[model samples]
Target: DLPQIVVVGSQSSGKSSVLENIVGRDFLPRGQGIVTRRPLVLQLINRQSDERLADSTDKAANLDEWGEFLHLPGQKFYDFNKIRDEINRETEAKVGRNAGISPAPINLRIYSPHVLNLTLVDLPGLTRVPVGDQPRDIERQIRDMILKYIQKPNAIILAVTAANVDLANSDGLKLAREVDPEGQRTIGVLTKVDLMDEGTDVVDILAGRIIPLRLGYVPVVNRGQRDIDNKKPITAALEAEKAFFENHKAYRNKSAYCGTPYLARKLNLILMMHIKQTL
Candidate 1:
């Protein structure tokens, strides 16, 4: 089995946002509670060159990015906007309009020279209770679905926790520790660091003062709903992230280990190292 990076977090923990920032694309369906009803097997393949092509007769050779789905084979989605619509349509088709979770996975491959060759599983965020029209055991349903993936030996747990929340009670980190007692394959990703109070920060958490992991932690600041609604480009948001870290007091000293770019590189490096060892 190939090593996979699985994202884990609670509702509104900024899990999807973290993945979107990592891929440098806002293709994930964003909305209220449980926007992601099914597990998305996002396989990002880097296509910087024409290594797969036998001849140079192809048009659109310089295309930046395109996506393919296993359900609808042979179809390529060149527009990232369409990818978002496809995800929403596919999720609704299976899980319906209600607040339900599906174990069936949506297999999607995105080939982009701007992204790293990585496979990330975006799961339904964990919830404590069921909402309107949702099953009474919705919480258990989501927990079990998350467990199915992280329990696998090849799955590396990307435990995402909001900096505004208490780390001791982090559902994602608790579950990650359950599957990885020593925290060998778990990486803590602190999201919404920008939302914290002016004088407070996650410098201690990132320093392993609370919980220690083999992969340590990476702090990131993703675009809020305001920026998303305004259709702000991720590139600009990345620039803003760099500026925030470079100017902030707590992070300025440790800016090298913070931000989305560092997290992406950490994930990619881990994936590459694992693959090399397996080879």
Candidate 2:
């Protein structure tokens, strides 16, 4: 079986935000609380932007971007905004409007020239205390669900931790370590680097002094809530992230090693290598 990347992170860790950045599309539902209540098995298939339609005579081949759901086959979702709506509608129908979660994943495939060929399972954020009207065993349910995915032999753990928090107290890394003790199949992702305290940096953690991961760690800057509210383009966010690395005193020297673009390329290579070894 081909290896799939499983994204695991605590609430507000900017986990889904990173996925949005990777695809250069904002499709995931963003809110104050747990927005992703169901596992989303996202399959991103890259396509040629202008593949000659003269020889094929297929109208479908002309579309620049679209999405398909496993449950709702045959229908093409051309609008990225509708994809987010469908995700919310399906999740709400499957698990209700409460905080309850369902292990039955919603399989979605996005075909676009802007995306890379990657499969990632985005699970509900790890939480300790159940919120209003949430199930009492919500914590246990989420933990067991995340473990089931990461425990797979061909799965790679993308443990996301916020740069503002202590790496040692990271819930995502904690879960990953339990399954992959040596950190052989784990790639640590540090988010919210811009939100860190003034004059503070993640140089030590990025250098692998905090917790050693065989696959190493990648740091990314995420779009703040204010930026999202202002409808700032992802292209601009990416430019800002690049500039952050190039200008920061601690990251300038090693700027090439950080940011979302590098992380995406690294993931693609790692997945390809893992597939070759597995097969």
Candidate 3:
């Protein structure tokens, strides 16, 4: 059995962004308000591409060209883009045309040769206050649903926070505590460290000075909307990401804890450890 890593954070917290970056694709829908509404239980399988350098290939056809949905046995997501857009369409159907939310889960298996073998369930973002076109008790609803997943004893609590915002928003931190109070199996992911306020740095949070989590914090720099529009190859962007971490003044020696590549590897390690424990 593999350990499930649940991402708990506020709306627009880069939950989808981090996953897509790790997978090296721009398939996840992107925008301002609430892009995700249901849990996407993604199981990525790693394979070796024949006669192809898995790391440097640009052939989309090289992939399995198909994904499976537990609900639809004979159906297949031959087009990855369909898999992404279908998530939006399905969300609307379940939650309605309005900004309502649903509690159903989407179980998927993606075949890949360039990424880590991991099963990550992407949950809805934690909402703070209900606004126009939203349910009044949306906040409570989000918390309740998140608690259901993160509270799993074997789940790895990933607390994703925007480094630019106040580190005081502990809704994610608190919910994560239900099962990973001491954070032995919980890890913190700080997104958009590049967008931090003019004269501030999140090095302290990254260094575990703010709050200690046995697994520690990992910093990931996702592409901005503008950068995405230019269709920047994520693989190339990762090279820059590595250089950024390796060259940053404070995070120079901490390159091992930076970028999605490192995070993906860490997840693999965590899963393997638990598999051994399970056996």
Query: What is the lDDT of every predicted structure here?
Result: 0.85, 0.86, 0.76
Q: Estimate the Cα RMSD of every predicted model relative to the unseen true structure.
A: 4.5, 4.4, 3.9
Please give the ranking of all candidate structures by lDDT, highest first, separated by commas: 2, 1, 3
Query: What lDDT score is found at residue 119 in candidate 3?
Result: 84
lDDT of 2 by residue, 1-279 (tens): 679999998978988999989977677877745478999999999998733334432233436777899999897876666678889899889787766999989999999887788999998888888886789999899999999999997998999999999889999999999999998789989999999999999998877787988799999997899988887767788999999999999899998999999999999999988888864
Q: What TM-score goes with each of the models?
A: 0.92, 0.93, 0.88
Q: Candidate 1 on 12-76: residue-level lDDT in tens?
A: 89989987787776777776543778999999998885453333232333357788999999987
Q: Candidate 3 has what TM-score?
A: 0.88
**Candidate 1: clashing pairs of residues:** none
Q: Who is ahead in lDDT, 1 or 2?
A: 2
| lDDT of model 1 at position 193 | 89
| Candidate with the greatest TM-score versus the true structure | 2
Supply the TM-score for candidate 2: 0.93
Sort all candidates by TM-score, best to worst: 2, 1, 3
Q: Which sections of candidate 3 miss by over 4 Å?
A: 32-34, 50-61
